[PDB]
Design an enzyme around this catalytic site. Structure first.
Site, PDB file in Angstrom:
ATOM      1  N   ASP A 103       0.853  -1.206   0.000  1.00 10.64           N
ATOM      2  CA  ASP A 103       0.000   0.000   0.000  1.00 10.64           C
ATOM      3  C   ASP A 103       0.884   1.249   0.000  1.00 10.64           C
ATOM      4  O   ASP A 103       1.742   1.401  -0.858  1.00 10.64           O
ATOM      5  CB  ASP A 103      -0.991  -0.063   1.191  1.00 10.64           C
ATOM      6  CG  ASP A 103      -2.049   1.059   1.186  1.00 10.64           C
ATOM      7  OD1 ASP A 103      -2.966   1.027   0.339  1.00 10.64           O
ATOM      8  OD2 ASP A 103      -1.984   1.961   2.054  1.00 10.64           O
ATOM      9  N   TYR A 233      -1.620  11.054   3.103  1.00 13.45           N
ATOM     10  CA  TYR A 233      -2.464  11.449   1.979  1.00 13.45           C
ATOM     11  C   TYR A 233      -2.465  12.961   1.815  1.00 13.45           C
ATOM     12  O   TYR A 233      -2.537  13.464   0.702  1.00 13.45           O
ATOM     13  CB  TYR A 233      -3.902  10.934   2.168  1.00 13.45           C
ATOM     14  CG  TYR A 233      -3.990   9.450   2.016  1.00 13.45           C
ATOM     15  CD1 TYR A 233      -4.050   8.870   0.761  1.00 13.45           C
ATOM     16  CD2 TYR A 233      -3.974   8.616   3.118  1.00 13.45           C
ATOM     17  CE1 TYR A 233      -4.101   7.502   0.612  1.00 13.45           C
ATOM     18  CE2 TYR A 233      -4.013   7.242   2.971  1.00 13.45           C
ATOM     19  CZ  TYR A 233      -4.072   6.703   1.717  1.00 13.45           C
ATOM     20  OH  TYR A 233      -4.134   5.356   1.548  1.00 13.45           O
ATOM     21  N   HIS A 298      -7.779  -6.099  -1.068  1.00 14.08           N
ATOM     22  CA  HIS A 298      -6.623  -5.244  -0.825  1.00 14.08           C
ATOM     23  C   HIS A 298      -5.607  -5.809   0.191  1.00 14.08           C
ATOM     24  O   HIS A 298      -4.402  -5.745  -0.047  1.00 14.08           O
ATOM     25  CB  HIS A 298      -7.096  -3.883  -0.378  1.00 14.08           C
ATOM     26  CG  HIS A 298      -5.983  -2.937  -0.111  1.00 14.08           C
ATOM     27  ND1 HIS A 298      -5.455  -2.115  -1.085  1.00 14.08           N
ATOM     28  CD2 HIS A 298      -5.283  -2.688   1.019  1.00 14.08           C
ATOM     29  CE1 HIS A 298      -4.496  -1.376  -0.558  1.00 14.08           C
ATOM     30  NE2 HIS A 298      -4.374  -1.698   0.722  1.00 14.08           N
TER      31      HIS A 298
END
Length: 319
Positions: A103, A233, A298
């Site tokens: 990730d 992020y 995921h």
């Protein structure tokens, strides 16, 4: 069993989990995860003569010293800096170590390999393919253009906003929703609507996650909050500006890439074409074949721990 130490790393008190002896394998977790996500692989690989090292990254779990008020301190350069400092501290002799990452950890790893290929022997990256830098726009603006304001990456941009959304809900429910997610669509977090935008999977599909394992996560994020994690992020706009010097540059490290079939990241537009039809091999000339895991979402390190573990071992044994 697993040893835990605190190491001083790039101005942080970094928590590091350690198991085994032999050549070193640095494990880099993703969002919203911890060293604990590598649990199965650490054991599997330690038992086979490797030294598994898995830190909690900046802003996560027991690692401390990063200012949550300032996202800019979570830029990709700070993060790669942390890893390099960490490797000086714990790699010591070894010219090179093995890296395994998932990730955002994969994102960090790509940049580690771009900036310091001298430190990495070989790389296994999960979920996140190398992304060519778009000279037109950054990723936040790109993903917002396609999917709208409610797209999780957008909602995460403003400090407090997503933390406020989660506050009434509690870490446990939020983590459960995310870890258990299986739709190839991206997550949405419309204002005031909590987790109601995220579809549920058949309970049977998430049997890999146990109440106990979830509680570990829930308990950590209960204490730390999500700000450190989410700041990664937030730093994406600056990251675009900072990575300009590496336009056109290539990753020169032997790499294996593994992704779950229903991984939301795999279903970003153009991702499959990029991955399968040559683009990905162009940027990563030593990419040994891509692996897609059938029926996996995921969180592959945890959902398919054997398949992942074995792939890692078979690849690093070549070196």
């Amino acid at each position: 069993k697993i040893e835990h130490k605190m190491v001083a790393v790039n101005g942080l008190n970094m928590h590091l989990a350690e198991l085994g002896e032999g050549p070193t394998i640095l494990f880099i977790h993703g969002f919203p995860e911890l060293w604990y996500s590598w649990r199965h692989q650490m054991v599997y690989l330690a038992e086979r003569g490797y030294r598994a090292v898995a830190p909690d990254l900046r802003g996560y779990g027991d690692t401390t010293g990063a200012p949550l008020n300032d996202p800019s301190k979570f830029s990709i350069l700070h993060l790669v800096g942390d890893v390099v400092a960490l490797l000086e501290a714990i790699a010591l002799n070894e010219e090179k170590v093995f890296v395994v990452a998932h990730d955002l950890g994969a994102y960090i790893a790509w940049h580690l390999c771009l900036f310091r290929p001298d430190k990495v022997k070989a790389l296994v990256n999960l979920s996140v393919h190398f992304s060519k830098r778009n000279p037109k726009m950054n990723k936040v603006e790109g993903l917002k253009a396609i999917y709208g304001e409610d797209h999780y990456v957008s909602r995460f941009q403003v400090p407090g906003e997503i933390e406020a959304e989660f506050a009434p809900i509690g870490a446990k429910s939020v983590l459960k929703k995310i870890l258990t997610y299986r739709d190839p669509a991206p997550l949405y977090f419309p204002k005031g609507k909590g987790l109601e935008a995220i579809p549920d999977a058949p309970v049977a599909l998430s049997s890999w996650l146990s109440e106990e394992e979830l509680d570990y996560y829930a308990n950590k994020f209960e204490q730390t909050g999500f700000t450190g994690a989410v700041n990664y992020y937030r730093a994406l706009p600056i990251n675009w500006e900072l990575t300009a010097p590496w336009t056109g540059a290539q990753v020169k490290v032997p790499t294996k890439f593994i992704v779950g079939e229903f991984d939301l990241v795999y279903h970003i537009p153009g991702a499959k074409e990029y991955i399968h039809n040559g683009g990905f091999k162009k940027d990563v000339p030593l990419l040994e074949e891509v692996v897609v895991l059938e029926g996996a979402a995921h969180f592959v390190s945890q959902e398919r721990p054997h398949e992942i573990s074995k792939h890692i071992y078979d690849f690093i044994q070549k070196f």
